[PDB]
Amino acid sequence: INASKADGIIYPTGKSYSNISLTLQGLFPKHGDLGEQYIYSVGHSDSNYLGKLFVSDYATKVVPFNNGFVVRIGAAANATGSVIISTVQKTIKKIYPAFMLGSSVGNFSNGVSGRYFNHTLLLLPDGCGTRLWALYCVIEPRNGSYCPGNSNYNTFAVFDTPHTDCTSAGYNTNATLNSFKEYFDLQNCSFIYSFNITEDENAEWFGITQNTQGVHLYSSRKGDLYGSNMFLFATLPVYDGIKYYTVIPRSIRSKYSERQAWAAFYIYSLHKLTYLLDFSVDGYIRRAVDCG
Amino acid sequence: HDDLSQLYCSYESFDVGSGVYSVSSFEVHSRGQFIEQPNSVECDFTKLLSGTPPQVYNFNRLVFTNCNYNLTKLLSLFMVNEFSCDGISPDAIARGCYSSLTVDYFAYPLSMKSYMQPGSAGVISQYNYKQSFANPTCRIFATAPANLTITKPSSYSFISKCSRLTGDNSHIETPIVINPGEYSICKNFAPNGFSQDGDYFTRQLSQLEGGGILVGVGSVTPMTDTLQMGFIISVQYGTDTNSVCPMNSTTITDKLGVCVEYNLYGVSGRGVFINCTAVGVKQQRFVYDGFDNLIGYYSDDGNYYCVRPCVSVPLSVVYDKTTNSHATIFGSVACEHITTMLHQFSRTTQASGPLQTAVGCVIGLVNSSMVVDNCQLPLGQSLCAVPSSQLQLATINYTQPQVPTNFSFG
Amino acid sequence: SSLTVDYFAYPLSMKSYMQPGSAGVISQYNYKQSFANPTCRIFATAPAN
Amino acid sequence: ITQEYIQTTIQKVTVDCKQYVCNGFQKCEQLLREYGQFCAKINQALHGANLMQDESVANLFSDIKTHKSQPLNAGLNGDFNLTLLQVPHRSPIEDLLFNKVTIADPGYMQGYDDCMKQGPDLICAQYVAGYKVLPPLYDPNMEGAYTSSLLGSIAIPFPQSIFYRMNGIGITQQVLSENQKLIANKFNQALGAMQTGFTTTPLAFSKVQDAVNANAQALSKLASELSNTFGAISSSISDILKRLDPPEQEAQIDRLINGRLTSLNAFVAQQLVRSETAARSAQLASDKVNECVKSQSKRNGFCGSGTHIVSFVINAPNGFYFFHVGYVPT
Amino acid sequence: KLASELSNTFGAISSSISDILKRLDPPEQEAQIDRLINGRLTSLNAFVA
Amino acid sequence: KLASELSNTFGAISSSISDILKRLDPPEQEAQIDRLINGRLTSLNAFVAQQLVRSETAARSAQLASDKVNECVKSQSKRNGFCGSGTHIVSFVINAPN
């Protein structure tokens, strides 16, 4: 985190400032914070037929929510990088994180970590990168096979098949949602929300906070595009206190001939800090100072 | 009535010294209205008005943003018992607009009103609900309508105990107290209400949780004849572009550079609107400064307006006691602003003439182009007022051109 | 110097509509208390028969 | 050449107590009906301070009378180049001093209209906060006349008086006569070195900036004390009126009234002590002029280091600036 | 004077913030700490002058 | 100023303690009297600071008066403009109210 570039700064809501510098208390990342790096890979496909899912241990680990977190998305795009499952240099594309947030966690029938109880907030990107799903449902594991209701469970993941749902004929609105429905059953859904995302390779910033008014979703796509300032675009009516979140491992089922390189996104915790924000003439914050 | 009367009233004496006094300025009245209100959607109160209300420990929260509601209907439905408010009044809520409105409602007996007071030590403030005072709040207890869609639950219930057992013998008792505005961990034992007065619940907490044994006890109060409810409302003011307004739009193009009263998307006040170059983020409708004052506004006609506070014309009064003649100085104001704009001053001032000097427009001083070395009424910037019938405007000028011949002692 | 009393039949259930910040119909169309002088509002029960 | 700045004048500010405390609100004015005597006392104290300041300035500048000078030639009088201290109504060195000092311009003629028309300073905060900055007693064309007459007060033209002042300190007639050209060129380089003296590291320019910053700090404190809530729900009376009930409104408005009245009293005391200090400094400046400029002082260190020869005085943003030409062996 | 002005209560129940947090509820805690804050700020302003 | 500051209410119902004690209950009487006490103590502190500044200024001016007496009254002054205008012949001093 570099505060001199105003990285991860959430813009104030309902007002703007011009050509003045203010000190503010809010939820900002710490300067020089390395954060947590998450990489999404491509599944096993030896022949140009699909196979297993190549994921990491992101689903098993449970992270405290605290005051929220901010996500840096697609900062390594437009660059030559290696596919994770192999050693093939490819152009890095942008991938959107998938989240699972809740207020109580336990174990599955195996005894492995996970198993969010009662109403669980799901932030699943869809549309092959052009749609965001916000769901608030009770998560119920399905039995049989590798699903978490039978005693051989390994991990749960979200998969996409680009030669089926990323085609130019149309974009499957329910791709990652139907992939997620194969592991858990969605019951007693409080709300289902859909947000449209424009397809581009620009770097993005995503934030999420919580207070008495609900869960607030911030994105640099709204407002300061081609920038880093994050503006509020959604207020989910999630009034129970979120205590934990988990990054859902999202592995793409692509062939050997049509593999792709996907960026690594970074998650930084938010803290109740004081920041000196520098507002420009157009109102966007271009530099900041972390007083601590 | 006039100038030198305000001087007499401020000095509280019918005799004052001769000099130039800065009397109080004038009162500014709004010359128009700048209303800009959208066609908002009705707020969804159907969850409150239909269905059984929950208990206090399992309260329902309603958050309203960018909507218009009818307060008279809601107040007519509910028979309101005592209310207590801290940073707001109910009349202020019914009068103005605010950025958000958060309402917490539940089924609550009227005999337990004292357990919701801020200093309460009972179990309601410990395990069921604690009011938060970060925002202006009201605490309202009311009786639900009888024959309408709101239905009585079976009884009133609340959490009497909520603690954690540990110490490898389940013998150490540590109570788990809730935070202001938050739920309880023990609310999952009976989310729909306890059935008996002495209901005892037990649950093993996980490793990611505290790791002890959760123990929860719930009490039950018999249901009264009429359904009594509690409401914990809250408001916010500067957090959103759109506002929530309880239940016409004008234009500022014909009135620019004049003091008007504005009500812009829920933000109300008084100020002067002038055309300005667009600064700040456009999607944030209002531009503020370091002191949290409105300094700009992005209108619906695609014109950024610079907002300035309403100003009063400064006043100074020249007075000469011997000749009983007085003059009036408008400090650093041009005479065209006295004549064309405003024209709201004292009675005789509104009715020799207006003269433009280096210190501003003056009335009551006749120009004579005379020069004095010094005087007792300086006006500033080498100007002066010399009494004669009436005072005359003069100026101070310098004159610069000895073998000892005759004695002289100074 | 003087004492001014306003009295009227009034139920004790509608007592909270007489509080100075009320938004009900009593403060709007029936009676609004004035605070220009040291004042007091007393709710009482009349003597029985 | 050593440079010394002595202040003579502070900015004259009068505060409209009703507009400052209440900002034109009827409820606040009704509550301030019981505090009218304190507002009247504030206005009377500030008026008395400004009146005494004007009398001190007039007494300081009344030295033109009963005082005769002689006309001087153009920029070269004798072999001495005096175009830097002479008017072409300010000298070039006075203009150079004034351009290197950042002063927020108080519009005395039509500043109210300029601040009304302005879109995106404290001079425009004057009319929104309730205070007014009074214009100075004399137009700068009179101060320039005073400084020009003091330059004239050095029959007996400038080079002859300069050589007389050199003869008085212990240099004979022969040493002065054979080296007239060297003395003239050394004086010219000493005068030309004054261009680089208007820098923060010299003390006198720092004192000029300190006086300007003190006036700006007084105005900034008066403007920014209006944002104190004083324990109320807001620092604005409009928010109190829009958020509260009539019996609770008066408590918060009275808290704001008491805080603003106490702050005005503190400002009045600060203005009084600043005005007394400026009057004493103006007396010091008049004594310094009468000793160093109108004559030659035989006391070391008063008119600069070394042996005093001749002193030149020019106007300053809030006082007098001195150029003490001295003698130093090398 | 700077050290001894810290023992003034400015009308509060105590001159110690720990005592105020020990003895009072949050709506009165925020009201009684604010008097100490305003008094100490005014005393600091007088000291600065 | 010292006499007229006693008429300030400082936000109380009256500036008189006798009017407060005759119109209010003890838990509010203590609050109003504490308001008056705090206001009068702050005003007394401001008066004390002003008196200290005035007395230091008067002491410095008295030292200046002693220097002026020693320079102009007991001896003739050769300095220009220190004791009157023009040249100096003799000076006389008399007492003043302060």
Ligand SMILES: *[C@@H]1O[C@H](CO)[C@@H](O[C@@H]2O[C@H](CO)[C@@H](O[C@@H]3O[C@H](CO)[C@@H](O)[C@H](O)[C@@H]3O)[C@H](O)[C@H]2NC(C)=O)[C@H](O)[C@H]1NC(C)=O
């Ligand atoms: C990866 O490469 C793509 C190449 O298209 C980058 O997208 C381009 O980013 C530039 C950034 O300056 C955009 O230019 C801007 O365009 C707007 C609208 O025309 C204009 O108002 C701005 O002044 C600026 O010129 C450009 O439009 C955009 N193009 C597309 C197709 O998105 C992308 O930023 C690169 N990402 C990374 C992480 O390097």
Ligand SMILES: *[C@@H]1O[C@H](CO)[C@@H](O[C@@H]2O[C@H](CO)[C@@H](O)[C@H](O)[C@H]2NC(C)=O)[C@H](O)[C@H]1NC(C)=O
């Ligand atoms: C943005 O703000 C800066 C600083 O506040 C402004 O820069 C000032 O501009 C004025 C007028 O040209 C100068 O007199 C100052 O010296 C400048 N100050 C600094 C620190 O540079 C700038 O003009 C503003 N831009 C706007 C309002 O568009």
Ligand SMILES: *[C@@H]1O[C@H](CO)[C@@H](O[C@@H]2O[C@H](CO)[C@@H](O)[C@H](O)[C@H]2NC(C)=O)[C@H](O)[C@H]1NC(C)=O
């Ligand atoms: C807010 O609600 C009240 C009460 O429901 C509305 O007042 C009613 O209006 C209808 C139609 O004009 C009348 O027939 C009723 O007699 C009214 N009842 C009362 C008690 O006044 C009111 O119109 C609503 N406000 C708005 C803006 O629609």
Ligand SMILES: CCCCC/C=C\C/C=C\CCCCCCCC(=O)O
């Ligand atoms: C009325 C209960 C018995 C009081 C007398 C007994 C002991 C006195 C000691 C402590 C009292 C502290 C509690 C005060 C009232 C709490 C009310 C509430 O929590 O809402």
Ligand SMILES: CCCCC/C=C\C/C=C\CCCCCCCC(=O)O
């Ligand atoms: C009591 C019904 C409340 C229903 C909940 C919905 C909205 C409430 C929000 C704002 C209005 C505040 C009303 C305060 C109570 C009225 C008291 C009175 O006028 O005397």
Ligand SMILES: *[C@@H]1O[C@H](CO)[C@@H](O)[C@H](O)[C@H]1NC(C)=O
């Ligand atoms: C942070 O950004 C500034 C300006 O963009 C840059 O000078 C600085 O080197 C950056 N910090 C690091 C650690 O690279």
Ligand SMILES: *[C@@H]1O[C@H](CO)[C@@H](O)[C@H](O)[C@H]1NC(C)=O
């Ligand atoms: C998203 O796109 C669909 C398809 O065009 C459209 O119907 C919908 O209104 C869009 N959503 C928003 C919020 O604009």
Ligand SMILES: *[C@@H]1O[C@H](CO)[C@@H](O)[C@H](O)[C@H]1NC(C)=O
């Ligand atoms: C939460 O879930 C647990 C088990 O999954 C259940 O026992 C409890 O009643 C639930 N709480 C609710 C629905 O409030």
Ligand SMILES: *[C@@H]1O[C@H](CO)[C@@H](O)[C@H](O)[C@H]1NC(C)=O
């Ligand atoms: C959950 O699993 C972890 C890891 O095996 C274990 O440490 C913990 O005790 C388990 N908790 C429960 C409640 O089974």
Ligand SMILES: *[C@@H]1O[C@H](CO)[C@@H](O)[C@H](O)[C@H]1NC(C)=O
């Ligand atoms: C206001 O200013 C904008 C930009 O300077 C201009 O386009 C517009 O025509 C102006 N409107 C008026 C009424 O002057």
Ligand SMILES: *[C@@H]1O[C@H](CO)[C@@H](O)[C@H](O)[C@H]1NC(C)=O
């Ligand atoms: C007064 O009249 C003279 C000559 O008519 C003119 O030069 C001068 O500017 C006038 N003064 C004012 C203030 O108009």
Ligand SMILES: *[C@@H]1O[C@H](CO)[C@@H](O)[C@H](O)[C@H]1NC(C)=O
């Ligand atoms: C005197 O100095 C000025 C600049 O300070 C210069 O332009 C002028 O030529 C000089 N005079 C002579 C006679 O050299």
